[PDB]
Design a protein around this ligand. Structure first.
Ligand SMILES: CCCCCCCCCCCCCCCCCC(=O)OC[C@H](COP(=O)(O)OCCN)OC(=O)CCCCCCCCCCCCCCCCC
Ligand SMILES: CCCCCCCCCCCCCCCCCC(=O)OC[C@H](COP(=O)(O)OCCN)OC(=O)CCCCCCCCCCCCCCCCC
Ligand SMILES: CCCCCCCCCCCCCCCCCC(=O)OC[C@H](COP(=O)(O)OCCN)OC(=O)CCCCCCCCCCCCCCCCC
Ligand SMILES: CCCCCCCCCCCCCCCCCC(=O)OC[C@H](COP(=O)(O)OCCN)OC(=O)CCCCCCCCCCCCCCCCC
Ligand SMILES: CCCCCCCCCCCCCCCCCC(=O)OC[C@H](COP(=O)(O)OCCN)OC(=O)CCCCCCCCCCCCCCCCC
Ligand SMILES: CCCCCCCCCCCCO[C@@H]1O[C@H](CO)[C@@H](O[C@H]2O[C@H](CO)[C@@H](O)[C@H](O)[C@H]2O)[C@H](O)[C@H]1O
Ligand SMILES: CCCCCCCCCCCCO[C@@H]1O[C@H](CO)[C@@H](O[C@H]2O[C@H](CO)[C@@H](O)[C@H](O)[C@H]2O)[C@H](O)[C@H]1O
Ligand SMILES: CCCCCCCCCCCCO[C@@H]1O[C@H](CO)[C@@H](O[C@H]2O[C@H](CO)[C@@H](O)[C@H](O)[C@H]2O)[C@H](O)[C@H]1O
Ligand SMILES: CCCCCCCCCCCCO[C@@H]1O[C@H](CO)[C@@H](O[C@H]2O[C@H](CO)[C@@H](O)[C@H](O)[C@H]2O)[C@H](O)[C@H]1O
Ligand SMILES: CCCCCCCCCCCCO[C@@H]1O[C@H](CO)[C@@H](O[C@H]2O[C@H](CO)[C@@H](O)[C@H](O)[C@H]2O)[C@H](O)[C@H]1O
Ligand SMILES: CCCCCCCCCCCCO[C@@H]1O[C@H](CO)[C@@H](O[C@H]2O[C@H](CO)[C@@H](O)[C@H](O)[C@H]2O)[C@H](O)[C@H]1O
Ligand SMILES: CCCCCCCCCCCCO[C@@H]1O[C@H](CO)[C@@H](O[C@H]2O[C@H](CO)[C@@H](O)[C@H](O)[C@H]2O)[C@H](O)[C@H]1O
Ligand SMILES: CCCCCCCCCCCCO[C@@H]1O[C@H](CO)[C@@H](O[C@H]2O[C@H](CO)[C@@H](O)[C@H](O)[C@H]2O)[C@H](O)[C@H]1O
Ligand SMILES: CCCCCCCCCCCCO[C@@H]1O[C@H](CO)[C@@H](O[C@H]2O[C@H](CO)[C@@H](O)[C@H](O)[C@H]2O)[C@H](O)[C@H]1O
Ligand SMILES: Nc1nc2c(ncn2[C@@H]2O[C@H](COP(=O)(O)OP(=O)(O)OP(=O)(O)O)[C@@H](O)[C@H]2O)c(=O)[nH]1
Ligand SMILES: [Mg+2]
Lengths: 105, 345, 142, 172, 98, 51, 320, 120, 54
């Protein structure tokens, strides 16, 4: 803040729900709680400028968990390569992918 | 308005910026911007005539539209990072949209056309509030994210504001417009130095506030809106000419007045970063401010414009204004250059 | 982005050479200023029609294009007739030809004089800027 | 059913396109109800419930008032409808063409990044506690009474002050 | 989710275009300011639900709380503009050029 | 500085209270009867109404 | 504790002070129609404060030592010179009229401030609502220019609406042939030069503008001379008015509060009479203007704010 | 610049470690100029109100002088601490990164050939 | 020289130029409709500027 009054008085008006890994009602973790909790602990105390380079590994992983750009890309490529094979006629999905599995339990 | 309304409305006006300034979360910063927007509106339109209603309307639609854009930035950022604060990793376009919206809220040119008109339609004391206290909230947000701001956007806005404020003020006979364009030009200086040294933006804001406050108080003494109205001060409150003149030269950045310090230190720090071209144009167009401030000084303290018969009654009467704050702010805003090293740092 | 690449094609080769490529660039560059000027012009001081609106856009953009084309040619022509590339006086001659064109299109001898001097000096300082590496919008160092 | 959310967001988009062309506020208030309803269905599709019905409830009372103000202050003799003027009718039709173009274009140059028409539906719900009990959006919104009590102070004060604010604005 | 935000974000842009491109009625420009609130609320609601962040679900409600106040304050001003000229046309609000 | 286009501008009023050409007061004129369950048959009550 | 918000919030409220005779009464009429006597007995009988008609020297006698000032400090106009030469090209006529409006406007604020601060009623002879009859008379006879009339209507438009009107208006109708005779038996050599066509124009403005304008907001009482010659008859007519119209009905504590802040601030009262509109009639060059201003500040008790003048026996200055 | 340095308490006017610095002298040229700025204010106040400029209201004038010296004393003490901290952080940085601030041996003028520029 | 061409070139042309600019940029119609329309242009120029710097 610009007037760290909350920090001075030791209270917390809005500091305790700043990010995903904050406390949630009934102890329900947020999506990507593990990754964010890692990134915030990596970049703690070293400052913003150091953290932008020295916690790039933690951040790029959190960014991938949150937005899943690579995951959608990867699953787009698998499905699009399978589309091509099936049009040619060199691949027929398994029974458990065509709606005929033996369900578990 | 009855005392309950004033207590509620004036508390809310004060509350807004304090919420924006003390808040870690961005949504609570936005909330404070809403409190200021909502509570000022009844103050602006209190006299209820065709001009204050237009002023309170132009202000509302401008500041509400800017609010929605700021909120979009706060929300696109929560989508990108799952957090309620801007990070080094925040998308670049998210930051720029915040900058343009906040400048729209400050009145920085080219998003400035609303400010001179709104200041024109409202009473003097609400122009004081609007041109001073109401600037701290948007600025306190900007100072919290200065490592992130794109300097090219900031300098184009500052150069524009210094030029438009100079050219706009040069054509004005209405004092309230001269104060709005004065504000636009000074915000250019605060903003130009923001991404480099935010402390100098606070120095330039504070010195501007203590110069702009007594100037309004001086016009509120006789309720003088024009250059011809203020020209009668020699026959109404001649004791005021000594400090009106210095404050106007001080607002103009002339040495050895306190108002030279902000421009001089901003230029010095801009050239520590090799911002030579921008700094030179800024200082060269600040000269135009001094011209139409000089023209005002010509009309008030260095000449005696014709006066009217009815002003003799005005002299028989006794005034209870100004208060002890005018004198304190007049001296500090003009005779404090020898304390410069204690103000910058 | 490409549109940024195009405007950097102006400084890949020493002044006075690839003369039309440079004249084309500054002609487009002037047009972009003319279009941005018209946008504000028509929006803030609207015309009485819509054809009359479009006319003002065309009149500003061709004039702005003309200034850019006379600047980018006169600079490149002077810079090779004198065989002096790294020289601000070239850009002062081009900037003034630009200023003369502005006055010619505006029916104002006074503008030509002001335009020849103000724009010539602005053009010269742009050249002196590139030689000495002055940045318009530097980034925070300290 | 794989296109379900995409269609709701496409309908939402049009409702705001029609709204942006600004016909008579009688119809602008009709677009906000249908966008409000469409948007309510999106928050429901993504798993919400309380948040979906509230924004629908709140915008139902807002347009009721707005209707009363239109018939008193924003009504002219020949209220404009989306078909009333050929020029607006052009941009409503053209506006729909553009989205059919932007979606098709932007889908061509990335295929996954922005619009992934190939994979509509595959990426709606990411995670979900399958054995959960306490997960309704109402529980999250209800945190204002215990955890984010600050949210409610500013919200309550905003409304409290507003009564004083409007009574003075409208005063004679 | 990707396709939804793009459509939601473009919905916000269309209303920002609507707000920035006035016609006659001031009331119509007020409804575009509600088109923007609705777009932002739906984005925030979907963001919070998708990421399972329950602690952020108070925030979309405050947006509605602080959006009503504007709608109320906006409508209150529209009454004063109508009491002066008998309509809400923006072209009437131009006395302050001088 | 006078310019041809602002040659028609006037100085604002000394107290910000701009004189306006008197606004048209129009009330809704409504026929209440003859055919109306409350008119008692043959009353054409022409009412001028504000709200 | 000067009146202000904190004084009102702690109890100083007007509506408690008002009683049936907390009224503003204005006695109007032509020249030598008996306003002085009638206004003085209305006030004495009803327990109201009497304000004699505001003249050239009204504000000299309410400030300082209450002694008349040299005519250069007090308006630089002459009623006697108006009657001797009503068309003089030194602008006396409209200077006199413009000054008289300002002094009346000040007396009205003095009268109203008394009403709202104590509850006692006031009786004024003419006021700022009837003042215009004299202006219209001047213009019809060619004694002022059309621009002077515009400048009067401008100042009036900026000052009159701020104030509440009289509760009651007591016009005294005297026909000109009788008026012209009363002026002749009065005595003043200058006042006997008044034209009867000027007196008639004062009577026409009264009956064609003043009285129809005031009946829409005030109880108006019109008395022929013989009815007025017994003031007790007029006061019994005032004790039974109902007062069922006008702005005074819609007034509460906080409308009065802001009217009381206006009328206690005499520079705020007079503010708009001094607007920089440059009629040669009323404009003063800096040389003459500065000479006068400086001479005025060397007057006994006028050099510093009241209470800091050691000349006139003020004490404890170094602690005030 | 120094906002987020270690151990920086929030909204602390004069941290404890400032007490290791010598206090401003009471008759400091900077404090004394505050006293004069206070005195002028009292004079300007009397001028604006139309009172005897120097004779009137000496209680006010005394309290204007006292207020500005009192506030200036404590404000001066804070700026000394801020300036002391700046050097403290500046020099400790030089120590922790010696390879970045190398000591240089500067040749004497016997060995330097400054070009000569005749003035004819 | 002194009375004419030295006036015309420096002090007079400088005052003419700046009077010319203060006339162009100050004659606004006071219409919120036109102001927002320019605010719309500003926003697009910032979008375009940021676009060609990616
Ligand atoms: C950061 C603060 C920025 C300044 C914001 C202005 C706040 C004051 C609002 C205002 O209404 O100013 C006028 C105020 C009224 O006081 P006055 O002129 O004496 O008249 C009524 C008193 N009876 O007159 C004042 O007292 C103004 C004093 C301004 C104090 C500025 C301190 C810095
Ligand atoms: C980046 C900052 C944005 C630039 C600032 C925008 C200011 C716009 C403006 O004030 O333009 C008003 C001006 C009036 O238009 P007008 O009078 O018709 O033109 C001359 C008529 N003979 O319209 C104009 O003609 C001014 C010319 C455009 C100047 C601004 C754009 C220049 C960009 C290149
Ligand atoms: C108690 C009265 C409020 C304090 C005050 O007086 O401030 C000055 C201003 C009114 O000024 P004025 O009318 O000239 O006279 C005041 C006499 N005390 O009063 C105001 O402008 C209203 C102040 C309202 C803001 C205070 C909020 C109180 C809640 C804490
Ligand atoms: C203006 C142009 C002057 C520019 C040069 C600035 C210096 C001149 C001002 C001198 C005021 C002053 O110094 O008085 C403070 C004095 C303490 O001075 P000291 O710290 O002992 O030594 C400083 C020697 N220059 O202590 C005193 O004795 C001052 C007390 C008496 C003041 C009356
Ligand atoms: C400050 C520092 C001062 C020292 C610098 C002085 C160096 C220059 C000295 C020699 C200058 C020679 C000029 C001769 C005098 C010309 C003159 O004053 O005529 C004024 C004339 C007005 O013509 P007008 O048609 O009204 O302008 C268009 C507006 N409708 O012309 C005009 O005013 C209009 C000019 C419009 C073109 C301006 C060019 C600006 C280009 C900026 C590029 C960046
Ligand atoms: C200015 C800030 C400092 C003050 C702090 C806030 C506390 C103020 C305490 C003083 C309160 C006086 O405020 C009081 O308000 C009420 C309404 O609430 C006004 O009363 C009003 O409503 C009542 C309702 O019965 C009616 O008589 C009438 O409509 C009106 O007078 C009173 O006239 C005023 O006396
Ligand atoms: C923690 C809470 C913080 C509370 C902060 C309070 C800030 C101080 C606010 C001061 C407000 C008073 O300031 C304001 O003074 C001006 C005079 O200049 C008055 O304004 C006046 O203007 C003109 C003449 O001056 C009159 O015609 C008008 O009727 C009247 O309103 C206002 O009625 C009063 O509101
Ligand atoms: C190699 C160097 C070449 C130097 C020449 C290039 C610069 C030329 C500048 C031309 C400036 C304006 O050019 C001049 O504008 C005037 C405007 O008065 C116009 O002149 C025409 O119209 C004007 C009215 O405006 C009449 O008064 C004039 O008699 C008529 O000839 C022409 O268009 C041209 O005569
Ligand atoms: C050591 C001293 C040096 C003195 C230098 C003298 C050289 C002067 C050469 C100037 C030649 C150009 O001549 C130019 O004439 C026009 C006449 O319209 C003047 O300009 C005038 O007319 C123009 C139209 O063109 C209008 O904008 C305007 O009415 C006015 O500026 C210019 O101010 C002048 O610059
Ligand atoms: C008519 C008078 C006008 C006077 C000015 C004359 C202008 C004529 C020169 C045309 C210049 C073209 O403008 C061109 O802009 C690009 C924009 O990246 C500059 O580009 C430069 O800055 C960018 C910053 O974004 C750097 O990343 C880049 O490495 C560098 O080349 C070019 O150096 C410049 O040549
Ligand atoms: C208010 C107007 C609302 C109208 C909105 C538009 C409704 C129609 C939705 C269009 C969206 C895309 O709609 C449909 O999406 C699917 C998957 O989701 C695309 O993709 C489908 O075919 C591709 C091959 O092309 C295969 O990978 C697979 O069978 C499937 O992904 C289809 O090519 C497209 O037809
Ligand atoms: C002057 C204007 C302002 C005055 C009005 C505002 C007064 C403040 C009232 C709001 C009080 C909120 O009070 C604040 O509540 C929050 C949670 O709600 C508490 O904060 C708590 O949050 C959660 C609770 O689950 C814990 O994880 C956290 O560690 C704890 O600090 C603060 O300890 C308390 O200070
Ligand atoms: C391009 C397809 C994509 C969708 C496009 C639509 C996006 C939404 C735009 C909403 C704004 C409409 O933009 C519109 O601009 C026109 C000018 O063109 C202006 O409208 C004004 O001029 C037009 C043209 O004569 C009149 O028909 C209209 O009655 C008048 O108000 C308004 O400012 C705004 O109503
Ligand atoms: C980068 C900045 C460097 C330049 C510094 C600024 C210096 C100031 C120059 C601009 C201001 C001077 O502006 C100058 O004002 C004078 C004032 O008489 C105007 O002149 C005007 O005089 C009077 C009153 O103003 C009017 O009656 C007349 O009709 C008009 O000509 C000139 O037309 C203009 O040229
Ligand atoms: N031009 C001008 N003369 C005025 C004005 N008010 C008063 N006078 C003159 O000043 C004198 C005031 O005396 P009056 O009160 O009107 O007449 P009177 O002799 O006192 O008789 P009564 O007062 O009714 O008892 C009159 O001669 C008027 O002509 C004014 O507003 N304008
Ligand atoms: Mg008398």
């Amino acid at each position: 803040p610009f007037l760290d009054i909350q920090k001075k008085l030791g209270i917390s008006l809005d500091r305790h729900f700043m990010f995903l890994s904050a406390e949630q009602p009934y102890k329900n973790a947020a999506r990507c709680h593990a990754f964010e909790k890692e990134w915030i602990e990596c970049a703690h105390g070293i400052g913003g400028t150091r953290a932008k380079k020295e916690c790039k590994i933690e951040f790029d992983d959190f960014e991938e968990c949150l937005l899943r750009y690579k995951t959608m890309r990867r699953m787009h490529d698998i499905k699009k390569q399978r589309e091509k094979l099936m049009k040619e006629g060199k691949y027929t999905p398994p029974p458990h992918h065509s709606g005929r599995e033996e369900p578990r339990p | 308005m009855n005392p309950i309304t004033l207590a509620i409305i004036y508390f809310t006006i004060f509350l807004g910026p304090v919420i924006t300034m003390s808040s870690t979360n961005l949504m609570l910063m936005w909330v404070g911007l809403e409190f200021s927007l909502l509570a000022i509106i009844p103050m602006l339109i209190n006299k209820k005539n065709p001009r204050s209603t237009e002023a309170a309307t132009k202000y509302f639609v401008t500041q509400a539209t800017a609010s929605m854009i700021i909120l979009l930035a706060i929300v696109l950022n929560y989508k990108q990072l799952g957090t309620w604060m801007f990070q080094q990793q925040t998308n670049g376009l998210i930051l720029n949209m915040t900058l343009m919206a906040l400048s729209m809220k400050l009145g920085l040119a080219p998003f400035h056309f609303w400010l001179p008109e709104v200041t024109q339609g409202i009473p003097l004391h609400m122009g004081l509030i609007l041109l001073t206290w109401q600037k701290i909230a948007p600025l306190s947000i900007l100072i919290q994210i200065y490592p992130l701001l794109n300097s090219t956007i900031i300098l184009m806005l500052a150069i524009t504001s210094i030029f438009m404020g100079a050219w706009g003020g040069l054509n004005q006979t209405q004092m309230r417009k001269i104060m709005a364009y004065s504000s636009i030009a000074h915000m250019g200086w605060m903003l130009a130095i923001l991404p480099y040294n935010p402390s100098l933006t606070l120095l330039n804001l504070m010195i501007y506030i203590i110069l702009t406050a007594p100037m309004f108080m001086a016009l509120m003494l006789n309720n003088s809106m024009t250059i011809n109205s203020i020209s009668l001060l020699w026959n109404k409150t001649p004791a005021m000419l000594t400090m009106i003149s210095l404050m106007l030269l001080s607002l103009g950045g002339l040495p050895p007045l306190t108002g030279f310090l902000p421009k001089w230190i901003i230029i010095t720090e801009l050239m520590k970063n090799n911002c030579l071209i921008m700094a030179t144009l800024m200082a060269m167009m600040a000269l135009l401010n001094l011209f139409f401030y000089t023209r005002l000084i010509y009309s008030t303290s260095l000449t005696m414009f014709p006066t009217n018969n009815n002003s003799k009654m005005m002299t028989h009467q006794t005034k209870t204004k100004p208060n002890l704050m005018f004198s304190t702010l007049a001296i500090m805003s003009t005779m404090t250059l020898p304390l410069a090293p204690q103000l910058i740092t | 982005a490409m549109v940024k690449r195009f405007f950097e094609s102006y400084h890949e080769v020493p002044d006075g050479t690839q003369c039309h490529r440079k004249t084309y660039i500054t002609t487009a560059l002037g047009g972009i200023c003319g279009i941005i000027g018209s946008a504000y012009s028509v929006s803030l001081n609207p015309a009485d029609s819509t054809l009359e609106a479009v006319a003002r856009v065309g009149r500003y953009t061709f004039t702005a294009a003309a200034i850019g084309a006379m600047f980018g040619l006169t600079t490149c022509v002077s810079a090779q007739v004198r065989e002096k590339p790294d020289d601000p006086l070239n850009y002062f001659i081009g900037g003034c030809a630009g200023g003369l064109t502005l006055g010619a299109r505006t029916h104002s001898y006074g503008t030509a004089a002001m335009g020849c001097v103000y724009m010539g000096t602005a053009a010269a300082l742009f050249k002196i800027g590139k030689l000495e590496g002055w940045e318009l919008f530097p980034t925070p160092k300290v | 059913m794989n296109n379900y959310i995409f269609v709701l967001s496409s309908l939402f988009l049009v409702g705001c396109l029609g709204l942006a062309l600004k016909p008579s506020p009688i119809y602008g208030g009709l677009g906000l109800i249908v966008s409000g309803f469409v948007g309510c269905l999106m928050v429901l599709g993504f798993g919400g419930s309380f948040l979906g019905l509230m924004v629908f409830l709140i915008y139902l009372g807002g347009m009721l008032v707005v209707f009363g103000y239109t018939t008193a202050m924003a009504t002219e003799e020949y209220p404009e409808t989306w078909g009333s003027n050929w020029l607006i009718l052009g941009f409503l039709v053209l506006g729909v063409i553009m989205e059919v173009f932007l979606i098709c274009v932007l889908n061509y140059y990335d295929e996954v990044g922005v619009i992934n028409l190939d994979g509509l539906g595959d990426w709606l719900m990411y995670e979900v506690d399958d054995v959960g009990v306490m997960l309704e959006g109402g529980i999250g919104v209800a945190a204002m009474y215990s955890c984010a009590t600050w949210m409610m102070v500013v919200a309550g004060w905003s409304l409290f002050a507003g009564i004083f604010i409007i009574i003075e604005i409208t005063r004679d | 989710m990707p396709s939804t935000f793009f459509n939601l974000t473009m919905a916000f842009s269309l209303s920002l275009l609507g707000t920035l491109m006035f016609r006659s009625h001031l009331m119509s420009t007020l409804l575009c300011l509600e088109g923007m609130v609705l777009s932002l609320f739906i984005m925030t609601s979907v963001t919070s639900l998708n990421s399972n962040s329950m602690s952020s679900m108070p925030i979309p409600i405050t947006i509605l709380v602080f959006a009503a106040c504007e709608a109320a304050v906006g409508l209150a001003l529209l009454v004063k503009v109508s009491n002066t000229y008998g309509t809400d046309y923006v072209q009437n609000l131009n006395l302050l050029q001088c | 500085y006078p310019s041809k286009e602002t040659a028609h501008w006037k100085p604002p009023p000394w107290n910000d209270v701009d004189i306006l050409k008197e606004k048209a007061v129009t009330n809704m004129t409504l026929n209440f009867g003859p055919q109306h369950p409350a008119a008692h048959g043959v009353l054409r009550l022409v009412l001028e109404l504000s709200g | 504790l000067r009146y202000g918000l904190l004084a009102a919030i702690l109890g100083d409220k007007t509506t408690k002070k008002l009683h049936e005779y907390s009224r503003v009464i204005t006695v109007d009429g032509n020249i030598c129609s008996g306003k002085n006597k009638l206004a003085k007995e209305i006030a004495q009988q009803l327990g109201m404060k009497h304000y004699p008609e505001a003249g050239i020297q009204y504000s000299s006698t309410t400030t300082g030592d209450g002694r008349p000032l040299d005519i250069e400090f007090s308006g630089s106009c002459s009623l006697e010179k108006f009657y001797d030469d009503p068309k003089s090209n030194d602008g006396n006529s409209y200077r006199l009229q413009s000054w008289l409006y300002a002094s009346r406007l000040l007396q009205y604020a003095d009268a109203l401030e008394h009403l709202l601060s104590t509850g006692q009623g006031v009786v004024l002879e003419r006021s700022i609502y009837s003042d215009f009859v004299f202006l219209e008379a001047m213009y019809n006879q060619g004694y002022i220019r059309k621009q002077c009339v515009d400048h009067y209507n401008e100042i009036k438009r900026l000052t009159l609406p701020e104030y509440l009107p009289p509760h009651a208006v007591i016009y005294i109708d005297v026909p000109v042939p009788e008026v012209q005779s009363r002026i002749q038996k009065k005595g003043d050599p200058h006042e006997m030069k008044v034209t009867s066509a000027y007196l008639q124009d004062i009577e026409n403005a009264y009956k064609k503008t003043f009285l129809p304008k005031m009946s829409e907001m005030c109880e108006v009482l019109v008395y022929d001379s013989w009815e007025a010659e017994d003031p007790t008859k007029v006061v019994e007519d005032i004790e039974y008015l109902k007062y069922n119209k006008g702005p005074w009905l819609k007034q509460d504590d906080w409308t009065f509060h802001y009217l009381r802040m206006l009328v206690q601030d005499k520079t705020e009262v007079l503010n708009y009479t001094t607007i920089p509109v440059y009629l040669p009639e009323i404009t003063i060059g800096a040389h003459q203007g500065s000479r006068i201003y400086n001479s005025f500040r060397e007057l006994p008790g006028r050099k510093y704010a009241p209470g800091y003048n050691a000349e006139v026996g003020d004490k404890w200055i170094w602690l005030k | 610049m120094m906002n987020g340095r270690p151990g920086h308490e929030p909204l602390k006017f004069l941290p404890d470690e400032a007490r290791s610095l010598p206090p401003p002298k009471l008759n400091d040229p900077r404090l004394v100029y505050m006293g004069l700025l206070g005195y002028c204010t009292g004079l300007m106040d009397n001028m604006l109100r139309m009172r005897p400029v120097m004779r009137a209201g000496l209680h006010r004038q005394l309290l204007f002088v006292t207020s500005f010296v009192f506030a200036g004393y404590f404000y001066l003490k804070r700026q000394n601490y801020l300036y002391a901290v700046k050097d403290h952080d500046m020099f400790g940085y030089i120590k922790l990164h010696p390879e970045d601030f190398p000591e240089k041996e500067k040749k004497t003028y016997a060995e330097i050939l400054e070009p000569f520029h005749p003035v004819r | 020289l002194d009375l004419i061409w030295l006036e015309k070139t420096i002090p007079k042309s400088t005052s003419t130029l700046h009077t010319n600019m203060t006339t162009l940029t100050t004659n606004q119609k006071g219409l919120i409709k036109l102001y927002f329309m320019s605010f719309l242009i500003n926003i697009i120029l910032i979008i375009i500027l940021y676009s060609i710097n990616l």
